[PDB]
Amino acid sequence: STNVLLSLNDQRKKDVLCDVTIFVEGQRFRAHRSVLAACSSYFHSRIVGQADGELNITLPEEVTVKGFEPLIQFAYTAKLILSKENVDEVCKCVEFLSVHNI
């Protein structure tokens, strides 16, 4: 639910009880298992094939960290925030991070 979404959001922004770990350019996002499954079919491709408690994922060099940062908050809040400097790489509203056909 909505408050469930917010509670999961805060628990993400506690750095505690995080399942999936996204490794982009040494930077490591820590997020859950179910939410990134809800977000982008590319990730749910690489998760559900494993029941491991701890997971690891890397992303192609094409996907930029600057455009990558807002996407996690997008997934967690279901909210749209954008700036005029950073649009072209997200120009499909299916968020089109480089490769990236869902």
């Binding site: 639910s1 298992r33 179910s34 690891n56």
Partner: protein, 324 residues
């Protein structure tokens, strides 16, 4: 005996001089997510290499091909070589790894886009005792690594080919050996229904089939896997253009099954799922998600109606987390 030095960051630079201070039997080297040592830092230990068995280094990006050269050149014995996403790893070192120790039995070279074909030929010739195969979205690995790789060592049990550039013309040939248990043909180019039928019927002893993120497979291939897949226990259907009628087909014609993963299917039938709810006897995997086409009666009533279904929606993986 058990190094397990994973995620040591910048703590191990010269220390390994006393862990193996007198040691002659290190067999559990796992330095995954290493960020401290250098080529010297691996070559100092690689001088002896006493009977290494489970060499492993995930995402050790800074280490070079000279690391693999030294670690494969100094011990003819090896049982697990699961290196990680480490880049700048050419194929010349893998040549020597195949040339020296021709007894390796388990590999993992995902996210190393330098092993397109030559690594396949070199560790396909001499080495034979291989058992598990897993790769990642590594392109330029042409269809030559499949036709030619089922030719030599037929005892392999795990096969991993997600996101590679191999053609179905090699998928034809995987019907050869009957030892294979796991498939990872994610991101492939239209395996036929005839291909799926041949590989299922010949390879009677098959456990897990991946086929994730494949668009071109119709509902019929799934319709017909189950008629002869007996010991198959899980299938991973994601983003496939199925018509959601093979669900009842696999609930009718398949009884030895407990795990099935329906991925990003555009159309999901509710009555077919209702029938599969009581069709089989070994299915409690109701991880309902992306459920825009759902009512509030089945999901409200089966919670207490069936104490054998736990659910794992984002609504569920919060109570369990609160309990701990």
């Amino acid at each position: 005996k058990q190094l397990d030095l994973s995620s040591r960051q910048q703590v191990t630079d010269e220390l390994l001089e006393k862990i193996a201070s007198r040691s002659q039997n290190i067999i559990e080297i796992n330095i995954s997510d290493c960020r401290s040592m250098s080529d010297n830092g691996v070559c100092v230990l690689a001088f002896k290499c006493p009977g290494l068995l489970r060499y492993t280094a995930y995402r050790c990006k800074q280490l070079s091909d000279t690391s693999i050269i030294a670690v494969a050149s100094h011990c003819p014995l090896l049982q697990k070589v699961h290196v990680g996403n480490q880049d700048k790893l050419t194929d010349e070192g893998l040549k020597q790894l195949g040339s020296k120790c021709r007894e390796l039995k388990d590999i993992h070279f995902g996210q190393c886009y330098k092993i397109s074909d030559e690594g396949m030929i070199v560790i396909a010739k001499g080495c034979l005792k291989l058992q598990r195969i897993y790769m990642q979205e590594n392109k330029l690995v042409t269809d030559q690594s499949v036709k030619a790789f089922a030719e030599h060592c037929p005892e392999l049990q795990y096969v991993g080919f997600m996101g590679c550039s191999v053609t179905s013309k090699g998928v034809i040939h995987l019907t050869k050996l009957r030892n294979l248990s796991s498939l990872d043909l994610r991101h492939i180019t239209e395996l036929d229904n005839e291909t799926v039928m041949e590989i299922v019927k010949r390879c009677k002893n098959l456990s897990s089939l991946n086929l994730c993120l494949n668009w071109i497979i119709n509902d019929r291939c799934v319709e017909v896997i189950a008629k002869e897949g007996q010991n198959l226990k899980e299938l991973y259907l994601v983003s496939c253009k199925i018509t959601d009628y093979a669900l009842i087909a696999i609930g009718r014609y398949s009884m030895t099954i407990e795990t099935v993963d329906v991925g990003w299917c555009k159309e999901i039938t509710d009555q077919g799922a209702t029938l599969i709810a009581q069709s089989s006897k070994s299915l409690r995997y109701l991880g309902l998600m992306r459920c825009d086409k759902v009512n509030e009666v089945t999901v409200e009533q089966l919670v207490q109606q069936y104490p054998h279904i736990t659910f794992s929606t984002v609504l569920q993986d919060c109570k369990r987390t609160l309990e701990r």
